[PDB]
Design a protein around this nucleic acid. Structure first.
Ligand SMILES: [Mg+2]
Ligand SMILES: [Mg+2]
Ligand SMILES: [Mg+2]
Ligand SMILES: [Mg+2]
Ligand SMILES: [Mg+2]
Ligand SMILES: [Mg+2]
Ligand SMILES: [Mg+2]
Ligand SMILES: [Mg+2]
Ligand SMILES: [Mg+2]
Ligand SMILES: [Mg+2]
Ligand SMILES: [Mg+2]
Ligand SMILES: [Mg+2]
Ligand SMILES: [Mg+2]
Ligand SMILES: [Mg+2]
Ligand SMILES: [Mg+2]
Ligand SMILES: [Mg+2]
Ligand SMILES: [Mg+2]
Ligand SMILES: [Mg+2]
Ligand SMILES: [Mg+2]
Ligand SMILES: [Mg+2]
Ligand SMILES: [Mg+2]
Ligand SMILES: [Mg+2]
Ligand SMILES: [Mg+2]
Ligand SMILES: [Mg+2]
Ligand SMILES: [Mg+2]
Ligand SMILES: [Mg+2]
Ligand SMILES: [Mg+2]
Ligand SMILES: [Mg+2]
Ligand SMILES: [Mg+2]
Ligand SMILES: [Mg+2]
Ligand SMILES: [Mg+2]
Ligand SMILES: [Mg+2]
Ligand SMILES: [Zn+2]
Lengths: 71, 111, 57
RNA sequence: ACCCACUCGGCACCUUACGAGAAAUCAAAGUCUUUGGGUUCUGGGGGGAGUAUGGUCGCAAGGCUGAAACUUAAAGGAAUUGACGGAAGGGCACCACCAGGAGUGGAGCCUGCGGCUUAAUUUGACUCAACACGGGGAAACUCACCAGGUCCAGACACAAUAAGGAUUGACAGAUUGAGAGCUCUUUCUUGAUUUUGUGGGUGGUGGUGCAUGGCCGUUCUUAGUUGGUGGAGUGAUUUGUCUGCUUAAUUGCGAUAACGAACGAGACCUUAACCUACUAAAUAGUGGUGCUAGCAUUUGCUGGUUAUCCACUUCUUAGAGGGACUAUCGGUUUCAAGCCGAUGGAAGUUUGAGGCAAUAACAGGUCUGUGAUGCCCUUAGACGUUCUGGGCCGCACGCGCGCUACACUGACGGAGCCAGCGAGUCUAACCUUGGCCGAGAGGUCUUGGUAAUCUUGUGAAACUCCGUCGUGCUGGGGAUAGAGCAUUGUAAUUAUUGCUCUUCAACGAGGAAUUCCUAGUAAGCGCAAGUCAUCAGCUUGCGUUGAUUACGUCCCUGCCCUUUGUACACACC
């Protein structure tokens, strides 16, 4: 054939960063649990799923995309 | 190759066929293609009786070398047709006459 | 096959047809866990296999 | 001198073979394993090699005498079958000619191939047997090419990673052609489905048709192939299977050490022809009667009426039969097969046209029809696959199939008005009548049809008819080109198609060459089907109008046949 033209810079896939997951369950003083990271109100998300926090952003990841809640 | 074919021609023939035919084509242990015919008995090849009396089937036998082609041809005895022209259109059979007793002066009988 | 051994071919081929003619003639006169799987899910459909409560805040 | 009979000794020839030989053949090459008349000479697998060396003869050239080492499994003889030949003798054919017809080759365009150009212009095929072929009419798709973007749809096994998370997804923003979370910013989500690595698979219009199947094309518009009994040969083999005649034909007659047979040809099968004979038919049609309109009247002539009834089967339809067998007669010939003429017949060219078609051959074509396949390559920055766009159409030119024409046997405008083979919509938008709107293309409202029922009588085209034009590139011709309107489709730009006005080129019957064809054929002419969303200048079929000239021959060409030669048999590549 005509093997190997390839202008450089191959692409990587993704990482899914390590991120030892939620410690964001705030206790006050033994042993009340004040539950940082407010949850979503979609009936398919039974309040066990939470909301991410970016600028102008409270996003539900359990909804693969749906229901952009804004507060 | 011959034993398997030659035996099949024998079982078909032993089963009351008018004729049989086996073709093996392809490559078999050599690099070059060859093809054999194994045919014993009577077989017609042209015309409508083909549709009537000969049964053709080809199979592809896939082996570690390549793929051979099995072709089989069986010619059924048309006398046993049981729903058909009972013979080949060539068959022109004459009935045989019977010996006669001559002159025997008139001598008419009565009833 | 080489024609130098052709005799031994027609004989072992005939012998094959001999065996194929005996198997053909000997086979002419020869000698519950019900449980309803489609319904076992409707039979074992009894309760005590669920949990549902949600909707805080 | 000649004739006839004989007999010696000559040069030979003819037939036989008792006999001999591996055979070809041989009255010697016979009278040999039943091996002995006398005698001379030479040979002992093939090369090496008639070479080296010595001797000897010769003016020379060379003669006579004449090794070995080494190498090698064959060389050789006669015959048989093949295959081949730029040898001889015969045949067959409009893919040969003859007598002609209609042409192509010149022109414009259409189309395919080469060439050039290109990011790519994917590719197979190159004499008949590549080039309107791959059903190959590609806007996406197709699609193999090129510029770029995703995805795994990487089975399974072990190992690694890892429930403190193996892995999945994504809002917005950036980004990107893109409302692709492709990637990145941010950080929710996901739960053992994946990931990572190795082994092992998988896909591929990647390669190899010179590894194969299968299929097809070619030889073959041909007539060839084989076995039983017998005759010949030690044998492979041969005769049968053939000089001649005849045929489309190894089709027959006849001759005949052959006799009688089978595959292939023929038979057969399908289609187009003939039935006033059989069975019938509101999805086929006829007469009569109602019911019914028009013109004539003196009874008539010409229509309307999917059932208002009665009858029929000529036409139509398809079932079963019938018919042709080259019949009758006469010519011709070995009075054989046959062949030619006349009468009759629906039919007498294998009745016309097809389908099927033995044995064998080809390195013919097809891995790009196949989830047919060996092997090789590749397999995650992919030769997998999908998405976007481009390309297969690119244009100094060479070649092939075609289309349309150069006009007055014509264009044009009115008018007459006649076919046949088809196809046509279910979980659907196919074939479409009819009524309106529109110059047109088309639009819109409805309707019949899963069909002998509706489209459709497919009112097709040439053609026939009355006018306009007048030989002037003319009103022949319609390339090229501008402007406008519609249809197909997600998309029409490099213009899918259709309509309209305008623009009005080349081409005045075409060099050397070359194709096709013998009767409802040639040619002219349109139509249906295939392809198809849209696109036929292509193909496959169909009917319409309907000639001229052969009814012969081997000159050209192509191939079969013997004869013959061969040191070829992987068979003249
Ligand atoms: Mg036939
Ligand atoms: Mg002799
Ligand atoms: Mg001949
Ligand atoms: Mg002739
Ligand atoms: Mg001529
Ligand atoms: Mg000419
Ligand atoms: Mg994807
Ligand atoms: Mg792997
Ligand atoms: Mg590997
Ligand atoms: Mg494949
Ligand atoms: Mg080949
Ligand atoms: Mg092949
Ligand atoms: Mg090739
Ligand atoms: Mg002909
Ligand atoms: Mg012969
Ligand atoms: Mg036959
Ligand atoms: Mg009738
Ligand atoms: Mg007549
Ligand atoms: Mg080749
Ligand atoms: Mg194939
Ligand atoms: Mg594309
Ligand atoms: Mg092309
Ligand atoms: Mg062609
Ligand atoms: Mg006219
Ligand atoms: Mg208008
Ligand atoms: Mg309806
Ligand atoms: Mg004009
Ligand atoms: Mg003009
Ligand atoms: Mg001319
Ligand atoms: Mg069409
Ligand atoms: Mg085409
Ligand atoms: Mg010879
Ligand atoms: Zn949610």
């Amino acid at each position: 054939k005509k093997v190997y033209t390839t202008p450089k810079k191959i692409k990587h896939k993704h990482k899914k960063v390590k991120l030892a997951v939620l410690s964001y369950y705030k206790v006050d003083a033994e042993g009340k649990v004040t539950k940082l990271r407010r949850e979503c109100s979609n009936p398919t998300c039974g309040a066990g799923v939470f909301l991410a926090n970016h600028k102008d952003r409270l996003y539900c990841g359990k909804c693969h995309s749906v229901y952009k809640v804004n507060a | 190759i011959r034993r398997a074919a030659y035996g099949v021609v024998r079982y078909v023939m032993e089963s009351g066929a008018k004729g049989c035919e086996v073709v093996v084509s392809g490559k078999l242990r050599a690099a070059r293609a060859k093809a054999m015919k194994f045919a014993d008995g009577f077989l017609i090849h042209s015309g409508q009786p083909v549709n009537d009396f000969i049964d053709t089937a080809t199979r592809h036998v896939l082996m570690r070398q390549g793929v051979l082609g099995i072709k089989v041809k069986i010619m059924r005895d048309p006398a046993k047709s049981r729903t058909g022209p009972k013979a080949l259109p060539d068959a022109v059979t004459i009935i045989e006459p019977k010996e006669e007793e001559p002159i025997l002066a008139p001598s008419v009988k009565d009833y | 096959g080489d024609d130098k051994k052709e005799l031994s071919a027609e004989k072992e081929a005939q012998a094959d047809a001999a065996a194929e003619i005996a198997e053909d003639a000997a086979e002419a006169e020869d000698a519950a866990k019900k449980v309803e799987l489609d319904a076992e899910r409707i039979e074992t459909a009894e309760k005590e296999a669920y949990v549902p409560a949600t909707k805080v805040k």
